[PDB]
Amino acid sequence: TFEEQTECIVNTLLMDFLSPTLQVASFDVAIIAGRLRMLGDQFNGELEASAKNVIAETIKGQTGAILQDTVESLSKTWCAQDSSLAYERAFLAVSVKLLEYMAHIAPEVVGQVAIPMTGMINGNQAIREFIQGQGGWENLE
């Protein structure tokens, strides 16, 4: 169910970025999506170098490797300059803001990052335990 909830949330976030018509026209994903976007907007680091590399490897069919390494790198960098910020919360924030930027910069190919990012979050134990420890997706933020 948690794995399915992650899929819906990433779909909702992506659908909202690409089609604001669908957002308006259409476990409440809408409220969760909103809170993740609010958390995503707290990141102000450079994403141009990051987004381009992730997109490049996504086309080539090697999203898995670079995607987690990119999010982990930007999350560690942010946690080093923000002692208050938890690593697990930083990881989600960067993932949502990177998904946002990649949609604006590359709307044609961004959809091929949806499945990898879902697999990354579901596959990561540190991030999964943190989300469920906060009462799950429903209560996160």
CSV table of N, CA and C in Angstrom, one decimal:
chain,number,residue,atom,x,y,z
A,1,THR,N,0.9,-1.2,0.0
A,1,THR,CA,0.0,0.0,0.0
A,1,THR,C,0.9,1.3,0.0
A,2,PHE,N,1.9,1.3,0.9
A,2,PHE,CA,2.9,2.4,1.0
A,2,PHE,C,3.6,2.6,-0.4
A,3,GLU,N,3.9,1.5,-1.1
A,3,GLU,CA,4.6,1.4,-2.4
A,3,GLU,C,3.6,2.0,-3.4
A,4,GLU,N,2.3,1.7,-3.4
A,4,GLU,CA,1.3,2.2,-4.3
A,4,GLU,C,1.0,3.7,-4.0
A,5,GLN,N,1.0,4.1,-2.7
A,5,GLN,CA,0.8,5.5,-2.3
A,5,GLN,C,2.0,6.4,-2.8
A,6,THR,N,3.2,5.9,-2.8
A,6,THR,CA,4.4,6.6,-3.4
A,6,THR,C,4.2,6.8,-4.9
A,7,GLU,N,3.7,5.8,-5.6
A,7,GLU,CA,3.4,5.8,-7.1
A,7,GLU,C,2.4,6.9,-7.4
A,8,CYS,N,1.3,6.9,-6.8
A,8,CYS,CA,0.2,7.9,-6.9
A,8,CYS,C,0.7,9.3,-6.7
A,9,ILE,N,1.5,9.5,-5.6
A,9,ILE,CA,2.0,10.9,-5.2
A,9,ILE,C,2.9,11.4,-6.3
A,10,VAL,N,3.9,10.6,-6.8
A,10,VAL,CA,4.8,11.0,-7.8
A,10,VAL,C,4.1,11.3,-9.1
A,11,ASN,N,3.0,10.5,-9.4
A,11,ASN,CA,2.1,10.7,-10.6
A,11,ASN,C,1.4,12.0,-10.5
A,12,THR,N,0.8,12.2,-9.3
A,12,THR,CA,0.0,13.5,-9.0
A,12,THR,C,0.9,14.7,-9.2
A,13,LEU,N,2.1,14.7,-8.5
A,13,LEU,CA,3.1,15.8,-8.6
A,13,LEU,C,3.4,16.1,-10.1
A,14,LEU,N,3.7,15.0,-10.9
A,14,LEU,CA,4.1,15.1,-12.3
A,14,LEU,C,3.0,15.7,-13.1
A,15,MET,N,1.8,15.0,-13.0
A,15,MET,CA,0.6,15.4,-13.7
A,15,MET,C,0.3,16.9,-13.4
A,16,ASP,N,0.5,17.4,-12.2
A,16,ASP,CA,0.2,18.8,-11.8
A,16,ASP,C,1.2,19.7,-12.5
A,17,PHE,N,2.5,19.4,-12.6
A,17,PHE,CA,3.6,20.2,-13.2
A,17,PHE,C,3.3,20.4,-14.7
A,18,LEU,N,2.9,19.3,-15.4
A,18,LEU,CA,2.7,19.2,-16.9
A,18,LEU,C,1.4,19.8,-17.3
A,19,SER,N,0.3,19.5,-16.6
A,19,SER,CA,-1.1,19.8,-16.9
A,19,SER,C,-1.8,20.4,-15.8
A,20,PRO,N,-1.7,21.8,-15.6
A,20,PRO,CA,-2.5,22.5,-14.6
A,20,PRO,C,-4.1,22.4,-14.8
A,21,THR,N,-4.5,22.2,-16.0
A,21,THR,CA,-5.9,21.9,-16.4
A,21,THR,C,-6.4,20.6,-15.7
A,22,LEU,N,-5.6,19.6,-15.8
A,22,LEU,CA,-5.9,18.2,-15.2
A,22,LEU,C,-6.0,18.4,-13.6
A,23,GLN,N,-5.1,19.1,-13.0
A,23,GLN,CA,-5.1,19.4,-11.5
A,23,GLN,C,-6.4,20.0,-11.1
A,24,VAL,N,-6.9,21.0,-11.8
A,24,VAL,CA,-8.2,21.7,-11.5
A,24,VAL,C,-9.4,20.8,-11.9
A,25,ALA,N,-9.4,20.2,-13.1
A,25,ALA,CA,-10.5,19.4,-13.7
A,25,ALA,C,-10.8,18.2,-12.9
A,26,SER,N,-9.7,17.5,-12.4
A,26,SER,CA,-9.9,16.2,-11.6
A,26,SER,C,-10.6,16.4,-10.3
A,27,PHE,N,-7.1,8.7,2.0
A,27,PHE,CA,-5.8,9.0,1.3
A,27,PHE,C,-6.1,10.0,0.2
A,28,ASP,N,-5.8,11.3,0.5
A,28,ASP,CA,-6.0,12.5,-0.4
A,28,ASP,C,-4.7,12.9,-0.9
A,29,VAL,N,-4.3,12.5,-2.1
A,29,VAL,CA,-3.0,12.8,-2.8
A,29,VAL,C,-2.8,14.3,-3.0
A,30,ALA,N,-3.9,15.0,-3.3
A,30,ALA,CA,-3.9,16.5,-3.6
A,30,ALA,C,-3.3,17.3,-2.5
A,31,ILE,N,-3.7,16.9,-1.2
A,31,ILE,CA,-3.2,17.6,0.0
A,31,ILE,C,-1.7,17.2,0.3
A,32,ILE,N,-1.4,15.9,0.0
A,32,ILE,CA,0.0,15.4,0.2
A,32,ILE,C,0.9,16.0,-0.8
A,33,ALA,N,0.6,16.0,-2.1
A,33,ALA,CA,1.3,16.6,-3.2
A,33,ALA,C,1.6,18.1,-2.9
A,34,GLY,N,0.6,18.9,-2.4
A,34,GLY,CA,0.7,20.3,-2.0
A,34,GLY,C,1.8,20.4,-0.9
A,35,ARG,N,1.8,19.6,0.1
A,35,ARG,CA,2.8,19.6,1.3
A,35,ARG,C,4.2,19.3,0.8
A,36,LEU,N,4.3,18.3,-0.1
A,36,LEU,CA,5.6,17.9,-0.8
A,36,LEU,C,6.2,19.1,-1.6
A,37,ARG,N,5.3,19.8,-2.4
A,37,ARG,CA,5.7,21.0,-3.2
A,37,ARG,C,6.1,22.1,-2.3
A,38,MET,N,5.4,22.3,-1.1
A,38,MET,CA,5.8,23.3,-0.1
A,38,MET,C,7.2,23.0,0.4
A,39,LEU,N,7.4,21.7,0.7
A,39,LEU,CA,8.7,21.3,1.2
A,39,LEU,C,9.8,21.4,0.1
A,40,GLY,N,9.4,21.1,-1.1
A,40,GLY,CA,10.4,21.2,-2.3
A,40,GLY,C,10.8,22.6,-2.5
A,41,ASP,N,10.0,23.6,-2.3
A,41,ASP,CA,10.2,25.1,-2.5
A,41,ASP,C,11.2,25.6,-1.5
A,42,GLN,N,11.6,24.9,-0.4
A,42,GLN,CA,12.5,25.3,0.6
A,42,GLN,C,14.0,25.1,0.1
A,43,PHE,N,14.2,24.3,-0.9
A,43,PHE,CA,15.5,24.1,-1.6
A,43,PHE,C,15.8,25.3,-2.6
A,44,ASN,N,16.9,26.0,-2.5
A,44,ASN,CA,17.3,27.1,-3.3
A,44,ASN,C,18.7,26.9,-4.0
A,45,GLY,N,19.2,25.6,-3.9
A,45,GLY,CA,20.5,25.3,-4.5
A,45,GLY,C,20.4,25.2,-6.0
A,46,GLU,N,21.6,25.2,-6.7
A,46,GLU,CA,21.7,25.1,-8.2
A,46,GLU,C,21.3,23.7,-8.6
A,47,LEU,N,20.3,23.6,-9.5
A,47,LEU,CA,19.8,22.3,-10.1
A,47,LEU,C,20.1,22.1,-11.6
A,48,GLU,N,20.6,23.1,-12.3
A,48,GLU,CA,20.8,23.1,-13.7
A,48,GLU,C,21.8,22.0,-14.1
A,49,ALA,N,22.9,21.9,-13.4
A,49,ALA,CA,24.0,20.9,-13.6
A,49,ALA,C,23.5,19.5,-13.2
A,50,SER,N,22.7,19.4,-12.1
A,50,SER,CA,22.1,18.2,-11.6
A,50,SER,C,21.0,17.6,-12.5
A,51,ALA,N,20.0,18.4,-12.9
A,51,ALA,CA,18.8,18.1,-13.7
A,51,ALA,C,19.3,17.5,-15.1
A,52,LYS,N,20.2,18.3,-15.7
A,52,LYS,CA,20.8,17.9,-17.1
A,52,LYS,C,21.4,16.5,-17.1
A,53,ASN,N,22.2,16.2,-16.1
A,53,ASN,CA,22.9,14.9,-15.9
A,53,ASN,C,21.9,13.8,-15.7
A,54,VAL,N,20.9,14.0,-14.9
A,54,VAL,CA,19.8,13.0,-14.5
A,54,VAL,C,19.0,12.7,-15.8
A,55,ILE,N,18.6,13.7,-16.6
A,55,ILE,CA,17.9,13.7,-17.8
A,55,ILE,C,18.7,12.8,-18.9
A,56,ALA,N,19.9,13.2,-19.1
A,56,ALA,CA,20.9,12.6,-20.0
A,56,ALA,C,20.9,11.1,-19.8
A,57,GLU,N,21.1,10.6,-18.6
A,57,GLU,CA,21.3,9.2,-18.2
A,57,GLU,C,19.9,8.5,-18.3
A,58,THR,N,18.8,9.2,-18.1
A,58,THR,CA,17.4,8.7,-18.2
A,58,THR,C,17.1,8.3,-19.6
A,59,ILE,N,17.4,9.2,-20.6
A,59,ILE,CA,17.3,8.9,-22.0
A,59,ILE,C,18.1,7.6,-22.3
A,60,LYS,N,19.3,7.5,-21.8
A,60,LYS,CA,20.3,6.4,-22.1
A,60,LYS,C,19.8,5.1,-21.4
A,61,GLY,N,18.8,5.2,-20.4
A,61,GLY,CA,18.2,4.1,-19.7
A,61,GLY,C,19.0,3.7,-18.5
A,62,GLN,N,19.7,4.6,-17.8
A,62,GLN,CA,20.6,4.4,-16.6
A,62,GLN,C,20.2,5.5,-15.5
A,63,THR,N,18.9,5.7,-15.3
A,63,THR,CA,18.3,6.7,-14.4
A,63,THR,C,18.7,6.3,-12.9
A,64,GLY,N,18.5,5.0,-12.6
A,64,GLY,CA,18.7,4.5,-11.2
A,64,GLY,C,19.9,5.0,-10.5
A,65,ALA,N,21.1,4.8,-11.1
A,65,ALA,CA,22.4,5.1,-10.6
A,65,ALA,C,22.5,6.6,-10.2
A,66,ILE,N,22.4,7.5,-11.3
A,66,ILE,CA,22.7,8.9,-11.2
A,66,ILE,C,21.7,9.6,-10.3
A,67,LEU,N,20.4,9.2,-10.4
A,67,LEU,CA,19.2,9.9,-9.7
A,67,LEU,C,19.4,9.9,-8.2
A,68,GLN,N,19.7,8.8,-7.6
A,68,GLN,CA,19.9,8.6,-6.1
A,68,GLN,C,21.2,9.4,-5.7
A,69,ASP,N,22.3,9.2,-6.5
A,69,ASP,CA,23.6,9.8,-6.2
A,69,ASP,C,23.4,11.4,-6.3
A,70,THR,N,22.6,11.9,-7.2
A,70,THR,CA,22.4,13.3,-7.4
A,70,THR,C,21.6,13.9,-6.2
A,71,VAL,N,20.5,13.2,-5.8
A,71,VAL,CA,19.6,13.6,-4.7
A,71,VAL,C,20.4,13.6,-3.4
A,72,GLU,N,21.1,12.4,-3.1
A,72,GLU,CA,22.0,12.2,-1.9
A,72,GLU,C,23.1,13.3,-1.8
A,73,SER,N,23.7,13.7,-2.9
A,73,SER,CA,24.8,14.7,-3.0
A,73,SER,C,24.2,16.1,-2.6
A,74,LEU,N,23.1,16.5,-3.2
A,74,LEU,CA,22.4,17.8,-3.0
A,74,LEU,C,21.8,17.9,-1.6
A,75,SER,N,21.4,16.7,-1.0
A,75,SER,CA,20.8,16.6,0.3
A,75,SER,C,21.9,16.7,1.4
A,76,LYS,N,23.0,16.0,1.2
A,76,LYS,CA,24.2,16.1,2.1
A,76,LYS,C,24.7,17.5,2.2
A,77,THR,N,24.9,18.2,1.0
A,77,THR,CA,25.4,19.6,0.8
A,77,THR,C,24.5,20.5,1.6
A,78,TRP,N,23.1,20.3,1.5
A,78,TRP,CA,22.1,21.2,2.2
A,78,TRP,C,22.1,20.9,3.7
A,79,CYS,N,22.2,19.7,4.1
A,79,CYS,CA,22.3,19.3,5.6
A,79,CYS,C,23.6,19.8,6.3
A,80,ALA,N,24.7,19.9,5.5
A,80,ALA,CA,26.0,20.4,5.9
A,80,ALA,C,25.9,21.9,6.3
A,81,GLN,N,25.0,22.7,5.5
A,81,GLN,CA,24.8,24.2,5.6
A,81,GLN,C,23.5,24.4,6.4
A,82,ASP,N,22.8,23.4,6.8
A,82,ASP,CA,21.5,23.5,7.6
A,82,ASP,C,21.5,22.3,8.6
A,83,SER,N,22.0,22.6,9.9
A,83,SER,CA,22.1,21.7,11.0
A,83,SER,C,20.7,21.2,11.5
A,84,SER,N,19.7,22.1,11.3
A,84,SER,CA,18.3,21.9,11.8
A,84,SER,C,17.6,20.8,10.9
A,85,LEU,N,18.0,20.7,9.6
A,85,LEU,CA,17.3,19.9,8.6
A,85,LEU,C,17.7,18.4,8.7
A,86,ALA,N,16.8,17.5,8.8
A,86,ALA,CA,17.0,16.0,8.8
A,86,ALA,C,17.3,15.6,7.3
A,87,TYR,N,18.2,14.6,7.2
A,87,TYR,CA,18.6,14.1,5.9
A,87,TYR,C,17.5,13.5,5.1
A,88,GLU,N,16.6,12.8,5.8
A,88,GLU,CA,15.5,12.0,5.2
A,88,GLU,C,14.4,13.0,4.6
A,89,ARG,N,14.2,14.2,5.3
A,89,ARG,CA,13.3,15.2,4.8
A,89,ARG,C,13.9,16.0,3.7
A,90,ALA,N,15.2,16.2,3.7
A,90,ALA,CA,16.0,16.9,2.7
A,90,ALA,C,16.0,16.1,1.4
A,91,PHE,N,16.1,14.8,1.5
A,91,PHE,CA,16.0,13.8,0.3
A,91,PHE,C,14.7,14.0,-0.4
A,92,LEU,N,13.6,14.0,0.3
A,92,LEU,CA,12.2,14.2,-0.3
A,92,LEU,C,12.1,15.5,-1.0
A,93,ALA,N,12.5,16.6,-0.3
A,93,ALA,CA,12.5,18.0,-0.7
A,93,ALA,C,13.2,18.1,-2.1
A,94,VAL,N,14.4,17.7,-2.1
A,94,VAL,CA,15.3,17.8,-3.4
A,94,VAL,C,14.6,17.0,-4.5
A,95,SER,N,14.1,15.8,-4.2
A,95,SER,CA,13.4,14.9,-5.2
A,95,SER,C,12.3,15.6,-5.9
A,96,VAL,N,11.5,16.3,-5.1
A,96,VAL,CA,10.2,17.1,-5.6
A,96,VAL,C,10.7,18.3,-6.4
A,97,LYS,N,11.6,19.0,-5.9
A,97,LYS,CA,12.1,20.3,-6.6
A,97,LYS,C,12.9,19.9,-7.9
A,98,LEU,N,13.6,18.8,-7.9
A,98,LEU,CA,14.4,18.3,-9.1
A,98,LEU,C,13.3,17.8,-10.1
A,99,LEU,N,12.3,17.1,-9.7
A,99,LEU,CA,11.1,16.7,-10.5
A,99,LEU,C,10.4,17.9,-11.1
A,100,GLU,N,10.3,19.0,-10.4
A,100,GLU,CA,9.6,20.3,-10.8
A,100,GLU,C,10.5,20.9,-11.9
A,101,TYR,N,11.8,21.1,-11.6
A,101,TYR,CA,12.7,21.8,-12.6
A,101,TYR,C,12.8,21.0,-13.9
A,102,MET,N,12.9,19.6,-13.7
A,102,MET,CA,13.1,18.7,-14.9
A,102,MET,C,11.8,18.8,-15.8
A,103,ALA,N,10.6,19.0,-15.2
A,103,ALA,CA,9.4,19.1,-15.9
A,103,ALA,C,9.4,20.4,-16.8
A,104,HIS,N,9.8,21.5,-16.2
A,104,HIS,CA,9.9,22.9,-16.8
A,104,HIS,C,11.0,22.9,-17.9
A,105,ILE,N,12.2,22.3,-17.6
A,105,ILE,CA,13.4,22.3,-18.5
A,105,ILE,C,13.3,21.2,-19.6
A,106,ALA,N,12.6,20.1,-19.4
A,106,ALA,CA,12.5,19.0,-20.3
A,106,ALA,C,11.2,18.2,-20.1
A,107,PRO,N,10.0,18.9,-20.5
A,107,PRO,CA,8.7,18.3,-20.3
A,107,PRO,C,8.5,17.0,-21.2
A,108,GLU,N,9.3,16.9,-22.3
A,108,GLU,CA,9.1,15.8,-23.3
A,108,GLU,C,9.6,14.5,-22.8
A,109,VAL,N,10.6,14.5,-21.9
A,109,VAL,CA,11.3,13.2,-21.4
A,109,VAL,C,11.2,13.1,-19.8
A,110,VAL,N,10.7,14.1,-19.1
A,110,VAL,CA,10.6,14.1,-17.6
A,110,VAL,C,9.8,12.9,-17.1
A,111,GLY,N,8.8,12.4,-17.9
A,111,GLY,CA,7.9,11.3,-17.5
A,111,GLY,C,8.7,10.0,-17.3
A,112,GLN,N,9.8,9.8,-18.0
A,112,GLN,CA,10.7,8.6,-17.9
A,112,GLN,C,11.5,8.6,-16.6
A,113,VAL,N,11.4,9.7,-15.8
A,113,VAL,CA,12.0,9.8,-14.4
A,113,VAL,C,11.0,9.3,-13.3
A,114,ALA,N,9.7,9.4,-13.6
A,114,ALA,CA,8.6,9.0,-12.7
A,114,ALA,C,8.9,7.7,-12.0
A,115,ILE,N,9.0,6.6,-12.8
A,115,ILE,CA,9.2,5.2,-12.3
A,115,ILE,C,10.5,5.1,-11.5
A,116,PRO,N,11.6,5.5,-12.1
A,116,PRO,CA,12.9,5.5,-11.3
A,116,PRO,C,12.8,6.2,-9.9
A,117,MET,N,12.1,7.3,-9.8
A,117,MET,CA,12.0,8.1,-8.6
A,117,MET,C,11.1,7.4,-7.6
A,118,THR,N,10.0,6.8,-8.1
A,118,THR,CA,9.1,5.9,-7.3
A,118,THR,C,9.9,4.8,-6.7
A,119,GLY,N,10.7,4.0,-7.6
A,119,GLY,CA,11.5,2.9,-7.2
A,119,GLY,C,12.6,3.3,-6.2
A,120,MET,N,13.2,4.5,-6.3
A,120,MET,CA,14.2,5.0,-5.5
A,120,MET,C,13.6,5.2,-4.0
A,121,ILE,N,12.5,5.9,-3.9
A,121,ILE,CA,11.9,6.3,-2.7
A,121,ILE,C,11.4,5.0,-2.0
A,122,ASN,N,10.7,4.1,-2.7
A,122,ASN,CA,10.2,2.8,-2.2
A,122,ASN,C,11.4,1.9,-1.8
A,123,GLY,N,12.4,1.9,-2.6
A,123,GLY,CA,13.6,1.0,-2.4
A,123,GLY,C,14.5,1.5,-1.3
A,124,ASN,N,14.5,2.8,-0.9
A,124,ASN,CA,15.3,3.4,0.2
A,124,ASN,C,14.7,3.2,1.5
A,125,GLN,N,15.4,2.5,2.5
A,125,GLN,CA,14.9,2.1,3.8
A,125,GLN,C,14.9,3.3,4.7
A,126,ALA,N,16.0,4.2,4.7
A,126,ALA,CA,16.1,5.4,5.6
A,126,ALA,C,14.9,6.3,5.3
A,127,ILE,N,14.6,6.5,4.1
A,127,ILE,CA,13.5,7.5,3.6
A,127,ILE,C,12.1,6.9,4.0
A,128,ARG,N,11.9,5.6,3.7
A,128,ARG,CA,10.6,4.8,3.9
A,128,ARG,C,10.3,4.8,5.4
A,129,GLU,N,11.3,4.5,6.3
A,129,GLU,CA,11.2,4.4,7.8
A,129,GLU,C,10.9,5.8,8.3
A,130,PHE,N,11.5,6.9,7.8
A,130,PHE,CA,11.3,8.3,8.2
A,130,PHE,C,9.8,8.7,7.9
A,131,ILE,N,9.3,8.4,6.7
A,131,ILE,CA,7.9,8.8,6.3
A,131,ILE,C,6.9,8.0,7.2
A,132,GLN,N,7.0,6.7,7.4
A,132,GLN,CA,6.1,5.9,8.2
A,132,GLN,C,6.2,6.3,9.6
A,133,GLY,N,7.4,6.7,10.1
A,133,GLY,CA,7.7,7.2,11.5
A,133,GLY,C,7.0,8.5,11.8
A,134,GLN,N,6.7,9.2,10.7
A,134,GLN,CA,5.9,10.5,10.8
A,134,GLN,C,4.4,10.3,10.6
A,135,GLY,N,4.0,9.0,10.6
A,135,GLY,CA,2.6,8.6,10.5
A,135,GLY,C,2.2,8.2,9.0
A,136,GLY,N,3.2,8.1,8.2
A,136,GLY,CA,3.1,7.7,6.7
A,136,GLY,C,2.8,9.0,5.9
A,137,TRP,N,2.7,8.8,4.6
A,137,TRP,CA,2.4,9.9,3.5
A,137,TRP,C,1.3,10.8,4.0
A,138,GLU,N,0.2,10.2,4.6
A,138,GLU,CA,-1.0,10.9,5.0
A,138,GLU,C,-0.7,12.1,6.0
A,139,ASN,N,0.3,11.9,6.9
A,139,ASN,CA,0.6,12.8,8.0
A,139,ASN,C,1.9,13.6,7.8
A,140,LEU,N,2.7,13.2,6.8
A,140,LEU,CA,4.0,13.9,6.4
A,140,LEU,C,3.7,15.3,6.1
A,141,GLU,N,4.2,16.2,7.0
A,141,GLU,CA,4.0,17.7,6.9
A,141,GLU,C,2.5,18.0,7.1
